[PDB]
């Protein structure tokens, strides 16, 4: 996360960390949507141009963590993966269309003050909140800068980072990049004319873009950190997988596959 701040304790209790098991390496973010289902980005698990094809046994998740500078005994939890589902039309060849995956946990987690699931948007939340200029919130332990920067560094922070960023109108998203954008994506970030800065970056993939409903005061996961070009460049915007658009897939996997 670039130009974010340290999270308050319990501020993002749906935050999930996706680690490589051998050796232990933080790969991506993720989010908790029940005691046993975690959302992430497909590319965190499967990306053939890089010979990446992680199986259930390659990975583990950590939940309820605030700081990497401590084992948070009695608070943080771990699970191995029972099953991975990648969207069957995830487009790794071209543009990461449908950059979404579900992971089912071998050890369902007990909810606590630090561990709690996020909502998925209903139609009303999507229509009302997915508007240019409306801000959502992005969280992660990924890189602090695109490139090593004096007096900041680059790579992973100790404390979970948080940044609030406005949704950007589709034509501006489209015009910002030569990569082909689709309706299963949106973009967010400040424009050069707004002065404020901030973005996701490498390592934040799979983390949630959440918005708080003014109607019922619940948090809803609208996006998944998916891709960008650099981080926090002027005239560039982070790209997010559009959770609502892909929700019927999520529901079918959870409702039907067991």
């Amino acid at each position: 996360i670039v130009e974010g701040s340290d999270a308050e304790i319990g501020m993002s209790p749906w935050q999930v960390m996706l680690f490589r098991k051998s050796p232990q390496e933080l790969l991506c973010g993720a989010s908790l949507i029940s005691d046993r289902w975690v959302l992430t980005a497909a590319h965190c698990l499967l990306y053939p141009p890089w010979d990446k094809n992680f199986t259930e046994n390659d990975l583990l998740v950590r939940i309820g963590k605030h700081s990497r500078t401590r084992y948070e005994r009695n608070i943080e939890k771990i699970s191995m993966l029972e099953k991975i589902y990648i969207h069957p039309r995830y487009n790794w060849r071209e543009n990461l269309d449908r950059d979404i995956a579900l992971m089912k946990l071998k050890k369902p987690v007990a909810f606590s003050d630090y561990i709690h699931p996020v909502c998925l948007p209903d139609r009303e939340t999507a229509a009302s909140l997915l508007q240019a200029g409306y801000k959502g919130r992005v969280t992660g332990w990924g890189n602090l800068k695109e490139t090593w920067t004096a007096n900041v560094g680059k790579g992973q922070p100790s404390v979970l980072q948080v940044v609030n960023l406005p949704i950007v109108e589709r034509p501006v998203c489209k015009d910002s990049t030569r990569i082909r954008i689709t309706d299963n994506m949106f973009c967010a970030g400040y424009k050069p004319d707004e002065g404020k800065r901030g973005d996701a970056c490498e390592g934040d993939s799979g983390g949630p873009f959440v918005m708080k409903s003014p109607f019922n005061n619940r948090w809803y996961q609208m996006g998944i950190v998916s891709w960008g070009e650099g981080c926090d460049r002027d005239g560039k915007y982070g790209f997010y997988t559009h959770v609502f658009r892909l929700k019927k897939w999520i529901q079918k996997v959870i409702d039907q596959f067991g």
Partner: peptide
């Protein structure tokens, strides 16, 4: 339309 590949 509203949802990807649905119905």
């Amino acid at each position: 339309d509203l949802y990807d590949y649905y119905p």
